[PDB]
Amino acid sequence: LDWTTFRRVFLIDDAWRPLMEPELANPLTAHLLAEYNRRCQTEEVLPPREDVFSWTRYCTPDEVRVVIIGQDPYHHPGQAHGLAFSVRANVPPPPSLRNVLAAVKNCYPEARMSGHGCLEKWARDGVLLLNTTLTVKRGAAASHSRIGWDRFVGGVIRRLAARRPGLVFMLWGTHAQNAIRPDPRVHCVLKFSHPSPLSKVPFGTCQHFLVANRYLETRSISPIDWSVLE
Amino acid sequence: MTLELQLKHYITNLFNLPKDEKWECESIEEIADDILPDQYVRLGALSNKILQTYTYYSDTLHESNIYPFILYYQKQLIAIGYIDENHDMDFLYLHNTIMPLLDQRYLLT
C-alpha cells in the first residue's frame, strides 16, 4: 500500500501521515481497505468516500485536545459526514446527539447553540470526534462493525495518545470504554453511560465538557468553547 | 401492519399526538444491562447481550420527552416500549432470549 495513493483516495490531510501511514504496512490494513472497497462496489456505503476521513482535515494531530469516541456512522443518507455524533448542517439532531448538546448547554448555560447538530467548529478546535467503525451500509447499522476499522482506528488513536500526554478522552457507553482504555496517569479519562435516551442515566447530567476544561487549564491548555454556533 | 406502525399508533393515541407526524428512528447498539431494568437482566439471558435498538423521535415526541423503542437481539424481538420524562420505562413486550417474559402486544391494537 502506498501513502500517496491512499491519501488521494480519501483526501486525507497530510498532517496525519505519521500516525496513519504505519497502518499501511499491516496486511490487515490491506484486507480492510479491499473489503471496504468491495462493499463500495456491491452496496451503497456511507458516509461518502471523501468524508470517511473528514476528521483528518478539521484539525492536525497536534491540535487535538479532546478525544470523543463513537461506534459507527449514521446509516441514513444526509446524516454522517465523517465525525462521531455530528450530523450535516440541516439535519435535526437525533436523540443521542440532541442529548450530547443538552449536556453541553447544561454544563455551559451561555453556550451558543443553533439548535443544529453539525460539530465542525469543535472539530476545528481540536475535539477529535472519532468513530471506531468508519463506514456503514446505507440502511443497516453496525453493518461494517467487523470488517476491521476498529483495529485500524485504535492504532491511530494509540499513536496519537503516545505522542504526548494530557489528552482528554470522553468515553460514553460500554463499547467506547471497552475499546479505548487510555493510561489515566497520562491522560484525562472521562467516563459516562451512552448519550442515547435509552440509557439508564440521563446524559443531560454529564459534566464532561466542564471537567475536561478544568483539566486542560491545569495543563496550560486553553479550554474548549463548546458552542456549536460560531 | 409493521410493528413500528403498531407502536406509533399506540403511542400517538396514548398521548394524543398528531397521528400523521413523520417519525424518525435512531438505530444503535448497546448492552442490555445499560438499558433494561435490573430485574429484566440476568446472567445467561439478557445479560451481556448487545441489543440492536430502535428509538423513535419527532417534534411532538421531543416536546413530550417520550421515547418509544423496539429492541432486538440478532433479529429476535426483545422489547417494545417507551421511556418517559423521568425515565420510567413502560414495556408492551419483553423476551429474555430464553422465553417470553412479558407480552402485552394485544395492547397495541
From Swiss-Prot, chain A:
Keyword Ribosomal protein recorded: no
Molecular-function GO terms, alphabetical: uracil DNA N-glycosylase activity
Cleavable signal peptide: none
Chief location of this protein within or outside the cell: host cell
Location(s), subcellular: Host nucleus
Homology family: Belongs to the uracil-DNA glycosylase (UDG) superfamily. UNG family.
Protein keywords: DNA damage, DNA repair, Host nucleus, Hydrolase
Catalytic machinery residues: 72
Reaction(s) the record says it catalyses: Hydrolyzes single-stranded DNA or mismatched double-stranded DNA and polynucleotides, releasing free uracil
Entry EC number(s): 3.2.2.27
The organism's place on the tree of life at top rank: Viruses
GO CC terms, sorted: host cell nucleus
Function recorded in the entry: Excises uracil residues from the DNA which can arise as a result of misincorporation of dUMP residues by DNA polymerase or deamination of cytosines. Therefore may reduce deleterious uracil incorporation into the viral genome, particularly in terminally differentiated cells which lack DNA repair enzymes.
Stretch of the intact protein here: 107 to 334 of 334
Organism for this UniProt entry: Human herpesvirus 1 (strain 17) (HHV-1)
Protein's name according to its UniProt entry: Uracil-DNA glycosylase
Residue ranges crossing the lipid bilayer per the database entry: none
GO biological process assignments: base-excision repair, AP site formation via deaminated base removal
